[PDB]
């Protein structure tokens, strides 16, 4: 590793933000991420039990300490999906509207 | 407010309610067919000939009931995790950029006596 941040440590509402942001985009990033993470083909096919199969990958990856932002970013970079990295970094920030 | 960037415009990122089902059918009018067909490409759960039966099953009330329950057809697939994000890809195919924000009620002055 070379940074600090567990994706599993984020609140349920922030995981929903990822699970929604890719939902109205090109063919869900879970397919490209599963291949890079070394996820078995039968596990990918078991996660299609729900109409949002991306949520099933993100949730079942979050069950283990391998769910670091540092490992997630490395995999997104290998599949040329830095577009999603920027969109998430623009939500993982502070605000003061009131 | 949880919101995403789409076409350079902010839009609230949540499941569509009964308000959205009614405002949709009332605001698309003729575009009800087009959004339905565009949502087939964006959401494979709706790519079946649903529109063909929906048009006939809801022909009794017209464009209103036709489009009112078309919006429920997406919420039926998940509704907890389904959000306007998938619906906006259908409006993006028909350049309905202003409609995608008007749908959630963003037509208002966000607190400006109306």
Coordinates of C-alpha atoms in Angstrom, one line a residue:
Chain A
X1 CA 0.0 0.0 0.0
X2 CA 0.9 3.7 -0.2
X3 CA -2.1 5.7 1.3
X4 CA -4.9 5.4 3.9
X5 CA -8.7 4.9 3.4
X6 CA -10.9 1.8 3.6
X7 CA -13.9 1.9 1.2
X8 CA -15.7 -0.4 3.8
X9 CA -15.2 2.5 6.4
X10 CA -17.5 4.8 4.3
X11 CA -21.2 5.3 5.4
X12 CA -24.1 3.4 3.5
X13 CA -25.2 6.7 1.8
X14 CA -21.7 7.2 0.2
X15 CA -21.8 3.6 -1.2
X16 CA -25.2 4.4 -2.7
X17 CA -23.6 7.5 -4.3
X18 CA -21.1 5.2 -6.2
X19 CA -23.9 2.6 -7.0
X20 CA -26.1 5.4 -8.5
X21 CA -23.3 7.5 -10.3
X22 CA -22.4 4.6 -12.7
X23 CA -26.0 3.4 -12.9
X24 CA -26.8 5.9 -15.8
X25 CA -23.5 5.3 -17.6
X26 CA -21.8 2.8 -20.1
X27 CA -21.9 -1.0 -19.2
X28 CA -21.4 -1.1 -15.4
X29 CA -17.7 -0.8 -14.2
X30 CA -18.2 -4.0 -12.0
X31 CA -17.5 -6.2 -15.2
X32 CA -14.1 -4.5 -15.7
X33 CA -13.3 -4.3 -12.0
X34 CA -14.2 -8.0 -11.4
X35 CA -11.6 -9.1 -14.0
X36 CA -8.9 -6.9 -12.5
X37 CA -9.7 -7.9 -8.8
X38 CA -9.4 -11.6 -10.0
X39 CA -13.1 -12.3 -9.0
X40 CA -14.3 -15.8 -10.2
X41 CA -16.7 -15.9 -13.2
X42 CA -19.3 -17.9 -11.2
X43 CA -19.3 -15.2 -8.5
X44 CA -20.0 -12.4 -11.1
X45 CA -22.9 -14.6 -12.4
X46 CA -24.2 -15.1 -8.8
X47 CA -24.3 -11.3 -8.2
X48 CA -26.8 -10.8 -11.2
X49 CA -29.5 -11.9 -8.7
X50 CA -30.2 -8.1 -8.4
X51 CA -31.0 -5.5 -11.1
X52 CA -28.0 -3.4 -9.9
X53 CA -25.1 -6.1 -10.0
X54 CA -22.5 -3.3 -9.4
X55 CA -23.9 -2.9 -5.8
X56 CA -23.4 -6.6 -5.2
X57 CA -19.7 -6.4 -6.3
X58 CA -19.0 -3.2 -4.2
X59 CA -20.9 -4.7 -1.1
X60 CA -19.2 -8.2 -1.3
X61 CA -15.8 -6.5 -1.9
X62 CA -16.4 -4.3 1.3
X63 CA -16.7 -7.6 3.4
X64 CA -12.8 -7.8 3.4
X65 CA -9.9 -5.4 4.3
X66 CA -8.8 -5.6 0.6
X67 CA -11.5 -2.9 0.0
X68 CA -9.0 0.0 0.3
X69 CA -9.4 3.1 -1.9
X70 CA -5.7 2.6 -2.9
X71 CA -6.5 -0.9 -4.4
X72 CA -9.8 0.3 -6.0
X73 CA -8.0 3.3 -7.7
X74 CA -5.2 1.0 -9.0
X75 CA -7.9 -1.3 -10.6
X76 CA -9.9 1.6 -12.1
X77 CA -6.6 3.0 -13.6
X78 CA -5.8 -0.4 -15.3
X79 CA -9.3 -0.5 -17.0
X80 CA -9.0 3.2 -18.2
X81 CA -11.9 4.3 -15.9
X82 CA -10.2 7.4 -14.3
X83 CA -13.5 9.2 -15.3
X84 CA -15.3 7.6 -12.4
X85 CA -12.3 8.3 -10.1
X86 CA -12.7 12.0 -10.7
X87 CA -16.5 11.9 -10.3
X88 CA -16.2 10.2 -6.8
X89 CA -13.3 12.5 -5.7
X90 CA -15.7 15.5 -6.5
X91 CA -18.3 14.0 -4.0
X92 CA -15.7 13.0 -1.3
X93 CA -15.3 16.7 -0.3
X94 CA -16.5 19.3 2.3
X95 CA -19.4 21.9 1.9
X96 CA -21.1 24.8 3.8
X97 CA -24.5 25.8 2.2
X98 CA -26.1 27.0 5.5
Chain B
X1 CA -29.0 17.3 -1.2
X2 CA -27.4 14.2 -2.9
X3 CA -27.0 15.3 -6.6
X4 CA -24.9 14.3 -9.7
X5 CA -23.5 16.2 -12.6
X6 CA -25.2 15.4 -16.0
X7 CA -24.9 17.5 -19.2
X8 CA -23.3 20.3 -17.1
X9 CA -26.5 20.6 -14.9
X10 CA -27.1 19.5 -11.2
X11 CA -29.9 16.9 -10.6
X12 CA -31.1 15.3 -7.3
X13 CA -30.0 11.6 -7.3
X14 CA -32.9 9.6 -5.7
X15 CA -35.8 7.2 -6.4
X16 CA -38.7 8.8 -8.3
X17 CA -41.9 9.3 -6.2
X18 CA -45.6 9.6 -7.0
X19 CA -45.0 13.3 -7.8
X20 CA -42.4 12.3 -10.4
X21 CA -44.8 9.7 -12.0
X22 CA -47.5 12.5 -12.4
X23 CA -45.2 15.4 -13.4
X24 CA -43.5 13.1 -15.9
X25 CA -46.8 12.1 -17.7
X26 CA -48.0 15.8 -17.6
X27 CA -44.6 17.3 -18.9
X28 CA -43.4 14.8 -21.6
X29 CA -47.0 14.6 -23.2
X30 CA -46.1 13.1 -26.6
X31 CA -42.4 12.3 -25.5
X32 CA -43.8 9.5 -23.2
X33 CA -43.2 7.0 -26.1
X34 CA -39.7 8.4 -26.8
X35 CA -38.4 8.3 -23.1
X36 CA -39.8 4.8 -22.8
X37 CA -37.9 3.6 -25.9
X38 CA -34.7 5.4 -24.9
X39 CA -34.9 3.8 -21.4
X40 CA -34.9 0.4 -23.1
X41 CA -31.3 1.0 -24.3
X42 CA -30.2 2.4 -20.8
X43 CA -32.1 -0.2 -18.6
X44 CA -32.3 -3.8 -19.9
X45 CA -35.0 -4.5 -17.2
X46 CA -37.4 -2.4 -19.5
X47 CA -36.1 -3.7 -23.0
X48 CA -39.0 -6.2 -23.2
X49 CA -42.2 -5.2 -25.3
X50 CA -43.6 -3.6 -22.0
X51 CA -44.4 -0.3 -24.0
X52 CA -46.6 -2.4 -26.5
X53 CA -48.8 -3.7 -23.6
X54 CA -48.6 -0.4 -21.5
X55 CA -49.9 1.6 -24.5
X56 CA -53.0 -0.7 -24.8
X57 CA -53.6 -1.5 -21.0
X58 CA -53.5 2.3 -20.2
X59 CA -55.2 3.5 -23.5
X60 CA -58.4 3.9 -21.3
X61 CA -57.1 7.1 -19.6
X62 CA -54.5 8.0 -22.4
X63 CA -51.0 9.6 -22.2
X64 CA -51.5 10.3 -18.5
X65 CA -52.0 6.6 -17.2
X66 CA -49.7 5.4 -20.0
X67 CA -46.7 7.3 -18.7
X68 CA -47.7 7.4 -14.9
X69 CA -47.1 3.6 -14.5
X70 CA -44.2 3.4 -17.0
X71 CA -42.3 5.4 -14.4
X72 CA -43.3 2.8 -11.7
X73 CA -42.1 0.0 -14.1
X74 CA -38.4 1.1 -13.3
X75 CA -39.1 1.5 -9.5
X76 CA -40.6 -2.1 -9.5
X77 CA -37.2 -3.5 -10.6
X78 CA -35.4 -2.1 -7.5
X79 CA -36.9 1.2 -6.1
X80 CA -34.4 1.3 -3.1
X81 CA -31.3 1.6 -5.4
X82 CA -33.0 2.7 -8.7
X83 CA -32.7 6.5 -9.1
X84 CA -33.2 9.3 -11.7
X85 CA -29.6 8.5 -12.9
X86 CA -31.0 5.7 -15.2
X87 CA -34.0 7.8 -16.3
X88 CA -31.7 10.8 -17.3
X89 CA -29.9 8.5 -19.8
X90 CA -33.3 8.0 -21.5
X91 CA -33.9 11.8 -21.6
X92 CA -30.3 12.4 -22.9
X93 CA -31.1 10.4 -26.1
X94 CA -33.9 13.0 -26.9
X95 CA -32.0 16.1 -25.7
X96 CA -34.6 16.5 -22.8
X97 CA -31.9 18.2 -20.6
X98 CA -34.4 20.8 -19.1
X99 CA -37.1 18.1 -18.6
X100 CA -34.7 15.8 -16.6
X101 CA -34.3 18.7 -14.0
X102 CA -38.0 19.9 -14.3
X103 CA -39.1 16.3 -13.4
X104 CA -37.9 16.4 -9.8
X105 CA -39.5 19.9 -9.5
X106 CA -36.3 22.0 -10.1
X107 CA -38.5 24.5 -12.1
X108 CA -39.0 26.4 -8.8
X109 CA -36.9 29.3 -7.3
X110 CA -35.6 26.9 -4.5
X111 CA -37.4 29.2 -1.9
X112 CA -38.6 32.4 -3.5
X113 CA -42.4 32.9 -2.8
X114 CA -44.4 31.2 -5.6

